[PDB]
Subunit: 113 residues, 3 copies
């Protein structure tokens, strides 16, 4: 079954991000370029917020780049992590925390849709 | 003529980002490194906000990395997209939506200027 | 001695970011992959805020990629800049402004810790 964002956990009370884990074992090589890693977690977001997926610094330092991703407030699909091995072969084990979801205020503007 | 940020459009009502298109046809190769793509859109931003330029996930997944860029509230120059082809040759057609502008609250602090 | 975030400066009144400088001379090559650059600046952040470390566009355009980093509200360690030379050899002189700290509201949620 789909899991909502309310199922995510914070590492600590003062952690800005909600941790995102891949649900698959994935191996990445630099030549593969960007890959979208499955999380089994689904939008949408709390009212008046949007999300940003960012890397965890310990993962970034281990050579896996998470490309910052914008999660729209009303996206109801699966939140995937866009990732690339920078220089070396990187192996993601199932359940490893690979990224984090940050929630931010969605500012209203009069821009046309 | 310069176009202001109010001319940008959202893909959907609940889209966090305002789409940014290049005004030129540009081809990018990995060896070129970061390139600043013209948009013909100009700051400044709404009061008490700043901007962040981020990639669109469909573009990121096609091998074009947009480096997150900070747009200062009172910048009045042209908003450019900083982009790099990750692994392969990437071709941007004129008018293609390459990035998105997210607006965020500008927090005041007492840090010196 | 440790320096707090209140010691950072803005380039201009309307600058979104607080500039971060490396305290060391560092040379980076693409094959080195991500490196954590010392700043001598320490958390924590103002109440109800978290931080984001982002690149300065002039530095990004010179071939040094700063990986976006999340600074937790209650982190009390040293803020380091995660950086990689994209394509060429990059040299950071001591005191050069390499990145910027953006402060953002920390939204409360009921996610478990
Ligand atoms: O660019 C950065 C990013 C993070 N940091 C520090 C501050 C942040 O609060 C701390 C933890 O960052 P992340 O949560 O992104 N890293 P990770 O998930 O790997 O560690 P933790 O589980 O402790 O949160 O690392 C930096 O100094 N520079
Ligand atoms: O890292 C990400 C980024 C986006 N997404 C999903 C959520 C987001 O709302 C949706 C659309 O993202 P973008 O707007 O960044 N992509 P794009 O502009 O390519 O598609 P769209 O036109 O639908 O907005 O893709 C992820 O799952 N992971
Ligand atoms: O992706 C971007 C990032 C920045 N910019 C413009 C807007 C921003 O206000 C201006 C300055 O950006 P940064 O502060 O990130 N660059 P830098 O520190 O190199 O210049 P400055 O000292 O003037 O702030 O560059 C873009 O057009 N696209
Ligand atoms: Mg963390
Ligand atoms: Mg979009
Ligand atoms: Mg600056």
């Amino acid at each position: 079954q789909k899991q909502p964002i309310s199922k995510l956990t914070r590492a600590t009370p003062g952690s800005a991000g909600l941790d995102l884990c891949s649900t698959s074992h994935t191996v990445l090589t630099p030549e593969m370029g960007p890959q979208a890693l499955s999380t089994g977690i689904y939008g949408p977001l709390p009212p008046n917020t949007f999300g940003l997926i960012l890397g965890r610094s310990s993962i970034t330092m281990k050579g896996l780049q998470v490309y910052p991703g914008v999660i729209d407030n009303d996206y109801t699909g699966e939140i995937k992590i866009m990732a690339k091995a920078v220089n070396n072969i990187v192996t993601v084990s199932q359940g490893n925390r690979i990224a984090q979801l940050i929630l931010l205020p969605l500012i209203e503007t009069d821009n046309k849709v």
